Amino acid sequence: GDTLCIGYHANNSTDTVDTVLEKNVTVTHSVNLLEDRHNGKLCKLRGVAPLHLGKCNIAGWLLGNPECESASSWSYIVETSSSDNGTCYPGDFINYEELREQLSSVSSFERFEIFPKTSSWPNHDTNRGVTAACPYAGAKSFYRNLIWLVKKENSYPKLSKSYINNKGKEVLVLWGIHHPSTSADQQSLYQNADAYVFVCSSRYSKKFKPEIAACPKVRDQAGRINYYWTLVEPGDKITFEATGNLVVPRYAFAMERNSGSGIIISDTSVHDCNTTCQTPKGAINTSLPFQNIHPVTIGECPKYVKSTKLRMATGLRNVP
Amino acid sequence: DTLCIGYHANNSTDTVDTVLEKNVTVTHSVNLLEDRHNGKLCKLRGVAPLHLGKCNIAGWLLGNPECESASSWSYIVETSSSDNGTCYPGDFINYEELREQLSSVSSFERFEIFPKTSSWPNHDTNRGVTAACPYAGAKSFYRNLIWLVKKENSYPKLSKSYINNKGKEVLVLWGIHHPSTSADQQSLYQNADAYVFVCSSRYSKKFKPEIAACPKVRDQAGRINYYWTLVEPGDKITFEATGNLVVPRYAFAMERNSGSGIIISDTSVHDCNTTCQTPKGAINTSLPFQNIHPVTIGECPKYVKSTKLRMATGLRNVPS
Amino acid sequence: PGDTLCIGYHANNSTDTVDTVLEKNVTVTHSVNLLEDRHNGKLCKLRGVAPLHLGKCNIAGWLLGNPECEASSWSYIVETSSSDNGTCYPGDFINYEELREQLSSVSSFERFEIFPKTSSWPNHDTNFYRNLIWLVKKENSYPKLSKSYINNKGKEVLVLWGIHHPSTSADQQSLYQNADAYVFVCSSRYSKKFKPEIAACAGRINYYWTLVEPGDKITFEATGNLVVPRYAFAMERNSGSGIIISDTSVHDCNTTCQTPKGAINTSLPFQNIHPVTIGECPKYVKSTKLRMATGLRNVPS
Amino acid sequence: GLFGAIAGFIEGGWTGMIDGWYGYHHQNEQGSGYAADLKSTQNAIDGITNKVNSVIEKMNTQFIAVGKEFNHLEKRIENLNKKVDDGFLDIWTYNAELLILLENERTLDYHDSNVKNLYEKVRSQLKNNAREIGNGCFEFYHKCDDKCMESVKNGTYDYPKYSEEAKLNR
Amino acid sequence: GLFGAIAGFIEGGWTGMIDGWYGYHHQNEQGSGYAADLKSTQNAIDGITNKVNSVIEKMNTQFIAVGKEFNHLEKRIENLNKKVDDGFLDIWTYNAELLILLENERTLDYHDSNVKNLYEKVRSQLKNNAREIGNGCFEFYHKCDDKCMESVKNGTYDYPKYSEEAKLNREEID
Amino acid sequence: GLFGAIAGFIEGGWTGMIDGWYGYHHQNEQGSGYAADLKSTQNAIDGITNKVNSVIEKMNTQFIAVGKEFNHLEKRIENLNKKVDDGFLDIWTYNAELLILLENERTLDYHDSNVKNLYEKVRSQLKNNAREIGNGCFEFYHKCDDKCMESVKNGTYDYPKYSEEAKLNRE
Ligand SMILES: *[C@@H]1O[C@H](CO)[C@@H](O)[C@H](O)[C@H]1NC(C)=O
Known part of the structure; x- marks a missing residue:
């Protein structure tokens, strides 16, 4: 007979996130809220x-x-x-x-x-x-x-x-x-x-x-x-x-x-460069809410955190 | 014969905010923030x-x-x-x-x-x-x-x-x-x-x-x-x-x-009384927060930059 | 004579009481205390x-x-x-x-x-x-x-x-x-x-x-x-x-953590004992009790 | 519609029920009506008033003169003081608004859950003596007088009574 | 309950099932008794264990030389110290109480959920070969022996097998 | 899950549906394929977007030159400054990580709830005209063609039409 099923997305993403009841959950889509990248120069x-x-x-x-x-x-x-x-x-x-x-x-x-x-x-x-x-x-x-x-x-x-x-x-x-x-x-x-x-x-x-x-x-x-x-x-x-x-x-x-x-x-x-955020370690180009780079910043800057990673899950659990 | 199940709705114009949804009209809500002061010392x-x-x-x-x-x-x-x-x-x-x-x-x-x-x-x-x-x-x-x-x-x-x-x-x-x-x-x-x-x-x-x-x-x-x-x-x-x-x-x-x-x-x-007094004026409220003044003496609410804090008691308004 | 199969959940003698947002004093089958009041009263x-x-x-x-x-x-x-x-x-x-x-x-x-x-x-x-x-x-x-x-x-x-x-x-x-x-x-x-x-x-x-x-x-x-x-x-x-x-x-004794009241051996995240402490140990809090629910709502009958 | 009830398979609310949050509408030879369900409603009143009551409870102030005065050579610690008040202010703002959002969500979803659960209560009480028309309305395979409706609502409703009738009519 | 099982349409717990948080009670002519679903239970145990652990793992120590002394002309910065300490303490107490509140609620809802899931799983396996009487129970319109029982429990339930006797003892009513 | 759909009675996802988060896959006399229901997906995206945006908005900062200098008779207030900066650091890190965990959980629960919602929508729509297999699938007691399926998907599905054609086959 003719069938109609309801289901959800899955993809090739191995990107893992963290929740309270389970650790390292591979999900379909996510964003990183943490900028670990700095430009290395004043x-x-x-x-x-x-x-x-x-x-x-x-x-x-x-x-x-x-x-x-x-x-x-x-x-x-x-x-x-x-x-x-x-x-x-x-x-x-x-x-x-x-x-x-x-x-x-x-x-x-x-x-x-x-x-x-x-x-x-x-x-x-x-x-x-x-x-x-x-x-x-x-x-x-x-x-x-x-x-x-x-x-x-x-x-x-x-x-x-x-x-x-x-x-x-x-x-x-x-x-x-x-x-x-x-x-x-x-x-x-x-x-x-x-x-x-x-x-x-x-x-x-x-x-x-x-x-x-x-x-x-x-x-x-x-x-x-x-x-x-x-x-x-x-x-x-x-x-x-x-x-x-x-x-x-x-x-x-x-x-x-x-x-x-x-x-x-x-x-x-x-x-020779320009930035809206500068730390003694180097400069920063990011739109992100957080940075692990240096506690001392100048300009319009993300908040400093001790975090290794902060990753927000957007899509759902990934099950192929 | 019929029996239907449904929920209370009204004309309430009160809207609250939620992570997933903004300006959400709801039946019943409480303002937890005091915008109101006595205006005098x-x-x-x-x-x-x-x-x-x-x-x-x-x-x-x-x-x-x-x-x-x-x-x-x-x-x-x-x-x-x-x-x-x-x-x-x-x-x-x-x-x-x-x-x-x-x-x-x-x-x-x-x-x-x-x-x-x-x-x-x-x-x-x-x-x-x-x-x-x-x-x-x-x-x-x-x-x-x-x-x-x-x-x-x-x-x-x-x-x-x-x-x-x-x-x-x-x-x-x-x-x-x-x-x-x-x-x-x-x-x-x-x-x-x-x-x-x-x-x-x-x-x-x-x-x-x-x-x-x-x-x-x-x-x-x-x-x-x-x-x-x-x-x-x-x-x-x-x-x-x-x-x-x-x-x-x-x-x-x-x-x-x-x-x-x-x-x-x-x-x-x-001439007045009050249990909470501020440079801009006095305060009467049980509301846990106020945007009135940072400086307060007496027993007072937390100061917050918040313009409005609106907490939802009742449910979502869907009047038709 | 209808050959029943039923689905249900655990309950026990446990009197542990925990507070949720919309209801307080809830009896639960299991709980853990996160707040350490105990110390050896020694330096x-x-x-x-x-x-x-x-x-x-x-x-x-x-x-x-x-x-x-x-x-x-x-x-x-x-x-x-x-x-x-x-x-x-x-x-x-x-x-x-x-x-x-x-x-x-x-x-x-x-x-x-x-x-x-x-x-x-x-x-x-x-x-x-x-x-x-x-x-x-x-x-x-x-x-x-x-x-x-x-x-x-x-x-x-x-x-x-x-x-x-x-x-x-x-x-x-x-x-x-x-x-x-x-x-x-x-x-x-x-x-x-x-x-x-x-x-x-x-x-x-x-x-x-x-x-x-x-x-x-x-x-x-x-x-x-x-x-x-x-x-x-x-x-x-x-x-x-x-x-x-x-x-x-x-x-004669060792501690990871010392307070003027006494010392502490605990893995708990929270301590209300003394505001002054030395070594690696719980955050200090004014809480009288923090008890986290582990199991579920206890309904013996 | 986290639980899919409010703005869910039930498309909207009744402006005409003033008696409480969740309730019933009904039709028979004795006519129509909007009668609010009591128990559940009051339970929700308890939950929510305990929610806001608790939220208020949770904030404990200390007797405070925050203000200090620093002369022109005290500029540094003037700035440290400022940094403290501003840091704290920021954090308490964060806590305030965050709490508001989260508890808002949980509240609405709460209502949704109670609605649905009331529905499923009705349904699981009625079985096949009625059918689900949609929009959370049941159609009665038998005839329902006001004592029947009352038997439903109070939670006392008797299936085997209208059993045979419905069975035939069905 | 949020999902309406615990303190829900299942109105009570079983002091008689000691082997887990969730499980079944069965009846049939090979005998009755209590069992617990070890998979749902074990899963919940993992989830809650991890919740706790991640709660106690969310505090990393901030260490100092705290002990501080101020003279009688030092009063202002002394009160500044007091402000800092008191403020931090208020914030942390707040975060604690709040955390345990929320997470407690969420935990209870979690259990309710799991229970519901187990139930609707069983029910959706069965369909019309039995009848839900309420109270999280089913009356089998056919004969369900041990193997059949454990067949429902482990998810292998065969509808076609008993479908006929089910429709027989059923439509005789229907 | 919490709503028992994802990793639920529906065992897994479909690598073969690229067009959205949630959707259908069907077998017909006109043939088969995956297609996503773009309304529920779209609402999901509205929500998640507002969640992330809210997250980012909920932290915005006020002005300080973190540079401050004390001499050797200033040591006390130096350690006090340090205590401030560090305490605040811990507070914020905590807030961040906590927010992240909790909203990840809430988000997964959200997707699950949405899928379950969908499945109940369709089930409720079909009633007895189709049988529920599991894995979120229905087997039709009648012939559901393209127009029919897509009628289910926009919620316009007609029970009366297929009532008898279904009845006979349900036998
Ligand atoms: C001894 O203590 C007194 C007060 O207890 C104090 O006034 C005095 O300065 C101290 N003397 C020394 C040498 O510290």
Whole structure:
């Protein structure tokens, strides 16, 4: 007799999936929700190029370490496992991580001269302030973005220098304080046994006496420099007053607002490419909801998971 | 004859969502998400909040002239802009830690620990006011602080103590004046060298003044720094000053409740009750979720980004 | 006489009760409990290695060498609730909690005399804590001292010292001979200059610590007011360990998992016992009961 | 139609039954009617109210001031705090909506199952004394008065009574 | 029930069948008794075993140094720690309770299903050679001896064989 | 399965039907072949599609620079950050894998339910005019030609027409 049967699809698919009551169930159709593929290289992010600090690190970069060049904007900031050139002179960077967090969000960044080299310091010495910790082509040198002030004649007179903010945004400013290894040196440089420094915006107010001592030489300097920074609002005023022991700003930075950025640590080299998602391991091109690649991502990215596989069954059980 | 079996249907316009199907009309459903709030700032559980007006926590504690002040509360409120501040250019140490301390508490009796008159025979308790911190265009100052001055030209070293014989912690707040010049220092506290020393079973510190003139706010360039400590029962707090001390008058005895909070709200207060209160308004509901506000005090639903959460009780609508 | 064949399902005496969504308290033929409430109420070893029980002293009292205390490694560190620093004097311990969080990260822990008792201090006198020496004047004199250390191991070295603040100038001279005095110490990670703050609230001693990286040198220089390191601690890393606070007693036994309450042997995914645990073991939950149904609905008749 | 009843071989619902979720319609010499089945309906009310009641129960808050204040040097931990609140918020949103979808599906399918099961109850009660016309209607090989219908619905219906009659008529 | 067998048209379970979750009770002149279908049972045992195992295998350990201490000026980040811990704990408790709820329901439905399947399998083997009386039982319109019984049970049932006597004792009624 | 169709009384699938998930295979006087019922298949695809799309939509993320830096006196808050990142990681992984398993099960159950639904649709349609063999097959008690079969498939099948032709053969 004539027959009519009802039945279902089967095919050559060996693709296996997982359910709660049974493991490795071969099914007719499925999708993979997990991207295990990355492009193996650092890329541009949504057009913008990153900023690769190279041997220089954030500190060396903002302080104008001679080994860097000493530009303006970035999608994200990249440091290599070893970023050699540090803070040049042995010393301490105060609230470093905070600062790195402040740059962590921004792309705006106009470096200007807040205290123009020649004009600003009539009674003190601009050019004599080098050190053996900071080579420039083998010579004895210093940072680009800071001016180290010293005796002129035997005179190191009081200085009040004031920058009131005419820009439209926050201005990041750096300076430094020198604590000599000898009262000798102190009187060889700043001429005043007792000296003070102090600085105020409405935000920041502080005063330093040099604390004199020699703790073991780092880069053969037992003296120390402590590097400081602050953000001055617009229409506010930063004021420095020193009878000695002050490394003044030269180029200070102005930061404006677009809301994103970040920092990456990778030895992965920068290639020519573009991606909407970037990890220190490599870049990512996927539409997928999940990624096992790296926990650190930038841009529009899939969620990170410890999963070996995530596979969603679409079709039915496969029974040929 | 016939007997048919079928299901209830109605005019219900309610549609829910399901993995396999979207906008599905159904007979009966419940909204599990509260989109509805009181629209005003209300009471809590019968008892009240504490609303400082244009004053901020700092003001209320120091007794800023424009603050009224008292007793108790369920939770505290500080308006979107709470200005009336430190009215003397200066800095408050550990402001947010203090705020956090208050953030859980209710009872809180403000008393005079070092009564103005009798505590300082050898110092001038009257000349404690500045132009920057006015009253009605005249001069004013904080009511919880006595600013001690020269008696004639003299400023005797003072040692004052307070033992806490109450059962609570006691909040004691003081200040340190950094003058805009030596002229002020020796003109005022009359001792070129001045030192303040505060000793408790936890707090021990010695502030020597740092003189210098940085930017003037509130019309003037002077400086003052506020500090605070919680002193435990059966504990002595000790002050010693040859100068520069702005001194405790009122201290605050603290009865600790494990719950409370601080809300920053422009919204206008009112007479009500409620068990759930939010910056945008109050809340009445048993609904497990709300999209109203992330910040809520009292016993409240989970905050969710969800616009609508609709759960199906009845069955699929097929009216014909 | 119709010759029946029937189809049915199991039922038994089992009273096991489990909750479904739309119905609660359901009796089922079979179930399994996923929530382990059981522990041996002992402090045991962990994957072999015993823990370190600080006894009467707490971390500070331990490191500073409280004499009511008194080896190299541990699985985890244990403090009593009765634990205390062996002080002595009113002073404070600086960045104590950080120091602790650091100790939580270590494992091996060689200790050594950085500044030998006899040899090191010929010009001064020794005035208590074992790991430090309290230096005062010899006869009239407290000479300026400079002492250094370089790292001869491949590990960070924990160095602890202390600073005295006499309650009066009289004390100051009676001890250190110098009314005007400084102490300062720097490694390459560190510099500080402490000068005495003389006041009453006898005497007061503040304690500080630092880690000298391998090859780095540390320097102490004092005209007075110095409690110097006797022993310092060479420490090579684990990335983990842990600090338990428990009054429970330590026994001979092993555990994959330890809690301050006691330890656990269970394959269960969930544990409500204690929020604090060490080793590989269940997620912590506020649940009173999690019981998963295995068999079916029990309907004896 | 997971169980194939609602919008299934039963094409649609009756706007005219206001008395409950599942029920009967009927015809005889004594006329027509919509009478809602009681027991099953109430059982479903129990199941579902226990479903939503339970869903609500399952969420336990702790007494909370989430808000904290961080100064301009606290930016990092300000961001860590933010990351916490946002992470948690995300996860609870996920749980909320997910639960809603899943339990929605299970609910509708539940109704389907109860419908079908009521039907099969009827059918397995009637046997051949009636036949299945489709759209879940039974046609009676015998005559059904209101006591007959009532005997069906209450679950008491007697086959061997109308046995012979139906057998002939069939 | 969802599939309407357990607490369904089969209104009770059998304390008398100890050898499995599902099975048959039979009657005939070579004697009666209980049996369990070892294939359906064993399958369900596999499914549930795997459910459990995959539930306890869905937790991979996150280890740390948890113990953390904060000073009296550390209050804010301390409360941040509290927030983190409490929040994680709430989420996990939630996921647990929810998991056991759902999966319990699904398990019961699973059993109900399996039972139904066994039944309709038997019934669809038989057709009109017997009559379903309800309560998951069948009355044989013909004689079903041991071999016939086990023939239904193992799926080998021959309709044509007894078809005649079935139609005989049947249409005598029909 | 749960609905006992797939890997059920219907033993296996047909490699020979390429046009859909569910369908029929028939023997006739005009000959034989596999053909899929595209309405039930299509609904299946609607559902599965909305399920996957829903899955993907149900996770979408908010903005952070995962880069954060602490020094050696910051260790505590460092380990706290770590605790956060890791805890969240575990939570999400768990959510993912769980969702996947549960929706795979629900999906297979779904296909099964659909097939069973179809078979019951057809069976109910035919009534006694055909006999139920099993393996989801029917043997017709009359002659069902192309038009007849396709009439079954669109659900327009006419019982009255073949009533007698079936009766006689059912004998
Ligand atoms: C000893 O403990 C007390 C409180 O228990 C504390 O104030 C003090 O700082 C501690 N001393 C040391 C050396 O840790």
